[PDB]
Structure 1
Amino acid sequence: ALTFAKRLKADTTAVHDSVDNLVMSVQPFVSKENYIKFLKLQSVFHKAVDHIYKDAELNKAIPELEYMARYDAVTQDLKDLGEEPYKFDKELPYEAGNKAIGWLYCAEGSNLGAAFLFKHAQKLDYNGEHGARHLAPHPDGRGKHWRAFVEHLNALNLTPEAEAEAIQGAREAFAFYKVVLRETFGLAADAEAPEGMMP
């Protein structure tokens, strides 16, 4: 684990895969209702990181970071299907500091691998202009855009104890994503995909 980015990854791949499994478990693209529940979920998570993509300091460290946010697009997708911007019951996490850097990674990385999701959403007749705006690949190409993003993440070079809090934040970002998922899909507390399942 050299770079800060490859360390965030190393430490969170496990929980990442459990999310991958949990998302696939609830059949997101099986029907329309389900894809709508999938959007509500994406909506809550992205709402929860919107203040972080828009944070003034981080926007100084990462040029145009604020224009990378995808909550805006998710609200547009919900509209697409005659839906009001979903509203979460409780009050959303509003993280800051080192931990917030972990949420950002979690969020920006999901745009990287969103390829798989985008591919299955298009079957359901959804894409960049209708229903799947937030899953569409970045105009500069997922890989390029992500490598560019990783550059600035690594450039932050915070104290090793800071990078630590960020990894702790990325882990909590993932856990939270699952809490939201469980509630949106009517799953019990701590519900996880069938054990042993692999992507």
Structure 2
Amino acid sequence: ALTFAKRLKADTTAVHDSVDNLVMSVQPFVSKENYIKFLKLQSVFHKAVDHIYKDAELNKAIPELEYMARYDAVTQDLKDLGEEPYKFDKELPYEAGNKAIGWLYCAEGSNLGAAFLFKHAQKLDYNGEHGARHLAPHPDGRGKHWRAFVEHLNALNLTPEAEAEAIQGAREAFAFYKVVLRETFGLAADAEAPEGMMP
């Protein structure tokens, strides 16, 4: 690639697309019941990275990182749908160090690419003020907000060795997402979208 952020993307695009395909395959927008299952999935993942967004060390290198967390937004979307806060059945990952940087990339990048999901949530009359608060674009714009974030990520100046761990972290974050999705939508372990499906 060329930069840390670009290597992260390059090394995780295949798994990202597998997530895209799996999410769409379980029909998150076919019914209120399924959208709620989607929100529970989102709730678990965002709870899992909450401690990373609030990490003292990372907030010193990335100013205002603590305010980027979307866990509260997802929980409010659950409230809008008449659901109480959702709590994962199993123990939640609590990553740290370089691997935690990979999870942060995964979670924040999902904010950049949430435009598609937000459009379809809108079809159900769910918007940034009701039901899809966690999918709404950052006030500064998805792209502008992301580019600023990417600068900070690259500015961590992680060594090639550290990058490897972070990238592995990002891969594990996506992997965890699918594990939670399968449990939430009642799929077998390692279930995937129909083979050959394109994002």
1:173 CA drift (Å): 0.1
Which residue of structure 2 aligns with residue 141 of structure 1?
141
Larger mean Cα displacement after TM superposition, 82-91 or 133-142: 82-91
Distance 1:88 1:50 in 2: 14
- Write the distance in 1 (CA, Å) between the matches of 2:168 and 2:69: 22
Q: CA deviation at 1:168?
A: 0.1
Following the alignment from structure 1 to structure 2, what is the Cα–Cα distance between the partners of residues 142 and 35?
23
| 1-structure distance, mates of 2:9, 2:125 | 32
- Listed one character per residue, the Cα deviations across residues 85-116 of structure 1 (whole Å, up to 9, x for unaligned) are 11111110000000000000000000001000
User: Matches of 1:161 and 1:43 in 2, distance apart?
Assistant: 32
1:158 CA displacement: 1.2
Identity score, percent: 100
**What SS is found at the alignment partner of 2:173?**
helix
CA distance in 1 between partners of 2:74 and 2:15 (Å): 24
Distance 1:124 1:159 in 2: 45
1:165 CA displacement: 0.2
Structure 1 match to 2:46: 46
> Aligned equivalents of 1:158 and 1:18: distance in 2?
27
- 1:128 shift after superposition: 0.7
TM value normalised by structure 2: 0.99
Deviation at 1:29, TM superposition (A): 0.7
Q: Partners in 2 of 1:12 and 1:20 — Cα distance?
A: 12
Output the TM-score relative to the length of structure 1.
0.99
The residue matched to 2:87 in structure 1 has which SS? Answer: coil
**Cα deviation 1:147-191 (Å, max 9, x = unaligned):** 000000000011111011000000000000000000000000100
Which structure 1 segments of 5+ residues have no match? none
The separation in 1 between residues aligned to 2:98 and 2:113, in whole angstroms, is: 24
Match of 1:153 in 2: 153
Q: Which 5+ residue runs of structure 2 have no aligned equivalent?
A: none
Partner of 2:10: 10
Q: Give me the whole-angstrom Cα distance separating, in 2, the residues matched to 1:152 and 1:191.
A: 35
Q: CA deviation at 1:27?
A: 0.3
**How many residues are treated as equivalent by the alignment?**
199
Helix, strand or coil at the partner of 1:166:
helix
Residue 133 (structure 1) shift: 0.2
What is the rounded CA distance, in whole Å, between the counterparts of 2:90 and 2:30 in structure 1?
A: 28
How far apart, in 1, do the equivalents of 2:153 and 2:77 lie? 29
Query: How far does the alpha carbon of each residue in 1:25-54 deviate from its partner, in whole angstroms, 9 at most, with x for none?
Result: 000011100000000000000000000000
1:55-81 per-position Cα deviation (integer Å, ceiling 9, x unaligned): 000000000000000001001100011
Measure, in 2, the Cα distance between the counterparts of 1:88 and 1:145: 30
Runs of 4+ in 1 over 3 A off after TM superposition: none
